[PDB]
């Protein structure tokens, strides 16, 4: 196996993994690896109609998300189908470390599809999980693992008022641009768009985005994609919620400005709970240092 290194970008539906390199010249390059010998539940999706989570789809996602997001991994490409790639991923710098599929199957969160030392480990992992009755081998149908996914809040005003600007636990599921996200609100499972109050990063269009838009996307995306966070629901604008993300490592709204990836905006600065004085001040910090969006050649 031609072994390769990477960083976990995200865990997808069916526990396919997105792995990215270090950025050199532009946005980092990404690889979608599907875990080779194993089957996991497909998450909730929608198109002609809403289809719900399969049983054990979401608990599997969470398991690997909580273990992997932003770890350095290594991976092999067991095959390439006619442009999907199949392979193994190991937590750590070398290939004798934790095989993630083995960890998956061991919790009862995945099973093998319809031999060798690798597939012997997985049968062992499957039989340990089937004997201990973990995950989908547990005595049940699994219905309690399926989320009541709501893709629209019925009345945003009431819903924003209901929480009284008290931080709602949340997972960030997608970053459209540097200052708007898709976030999964817990414990209800409302999947909603959240814009950061008081800022606007540059945006994407057509075949050509504004300057630093991919930069700001990457910035917010590398720090927050598939992380547990808390979000202060501060107001709404149509189906979009205005709000502010809390994470231990800092305030993303506050950083984006201080690193010259965003500009203050007047309409939405009033609802910023954490203090409109401080956003105005961090804009000035990046301005005075002539940083990025504030360069003389831009
Ligand atoms: C998990 O990571 C994060 C999640 C959310 C936020 Cl708001 C920040 C981070 S961070 O720690 O990775 N980066 C930085 C923190 C502090 C100062 N700076 N300056 C430039 N970068 C940072």
Swiss-Prot record:
Ubiquitously expressed. Phosphorylated by PIM1 in vitro. The modification N6-acetyllysine is found at residue 166. The modification Phosphothreonine is found at residues 81, 208. It is found in: Cytoplasm; Nucleus; Melanosome. Residues 2-139, 166-296 form the TNase-like domain. A motif (Nuclear localization signal) lies at residues 289-293. Forms a ternary complex with STAT6 and POLR2A. Associates with the RNA-induced silencing complex (RISC). Interacts with the RISC components AGO2, FMR1 and TNRC6A. Interacts with GTF2E1 and GTF2E2. Interacts with PIM1. Interacts with STAT5. Interacts with SYT11 (via C2 2 domain); the interaction with SYT11 is direct. (Microbial infection) Interacts with EAV NSP1. Binds to acidic transactivation domain of EBNA2. Interacts with SARS-CoV-2 NSP9. Endonuclease that mediates miRNA decay of both protein-free and AGO2-loaded miRNAs. As part of its function in miRNA decay, regulates mRNAs involved in G1-to-S phase transition. Functions as a bridging factor between STAT6 and the basal transcription factor. Plays a role in PIM1 regulation of MYB activity. Functions as a transcriptional coactivator for STAT5. This is Staphylococcal nuclease domain-containing protein 1. It comes from Homo sapiens (Human). The chain holds residues 17 to 330 of 910 of the full protein.
């Amino acid at each position: 196996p031609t072994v390769q290194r990477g960083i976990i970008k995200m865990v997808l539906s069916g526990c396919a993994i997105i792995v990215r390199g270090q950025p050199r010249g532009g946005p980092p390059p990404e690889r979608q690896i599907n875990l080779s010998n194993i089957r996991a539940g497909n998450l909730a999706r929608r198109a002609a109609k809403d289809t719900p989570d399969e049983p054990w789809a979401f608990p599997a996602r969470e398991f690997l998300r909580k273990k992997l997001i932003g770890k350095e991994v290594c991976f092999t490409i067991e095959n390439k189908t006619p442009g999907r790639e199949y392979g193994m991923i190991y937590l750590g710098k070398d290939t004798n470390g934790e095989n993630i599929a083995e960890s998956l199957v061991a919790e009862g969160l995945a099973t093998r599809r319809e031999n060798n030392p690798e597939q012997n480990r997985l049968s062992e992992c499957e039989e340990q999980a089937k004997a201990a009755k973990k995950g989908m081998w547990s005595e049940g149908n699994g219905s309690h693992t399926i989320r009541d996914l709501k893709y629209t809040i019925e009345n945003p005003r009431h819903f924003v008022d209901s929480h009284h600007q008290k931080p709602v636990n949340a997972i960030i599921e997608h970053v459209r641009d540097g200052s708007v996200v898709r976030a999964l609100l817990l414990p209800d499972y409302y999947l909603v768009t959240v814009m950061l109050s008081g800022i606007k990063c540059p945006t994407f269009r057509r075949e050509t985005p504004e300057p630093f838009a991919a930069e700001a996307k990457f910035f917010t995306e590398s720090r927050l994609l598939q992380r547990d966070v808390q979000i202060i629901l501060e107001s709404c604008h149509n189906q979009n919620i205005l709000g502010t993300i809390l994470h231990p490592n800092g305030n993303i709204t506050e950083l984006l400005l201080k690193e010259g990836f965003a500009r203050c905006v007047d309409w939405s600065i009033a609802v910023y709970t954490r203090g409109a004085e401080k956003l105005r001040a961090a804009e000035r910090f990046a301005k005075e240092r002539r940083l990025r969006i504030w360069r003389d050649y831009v």
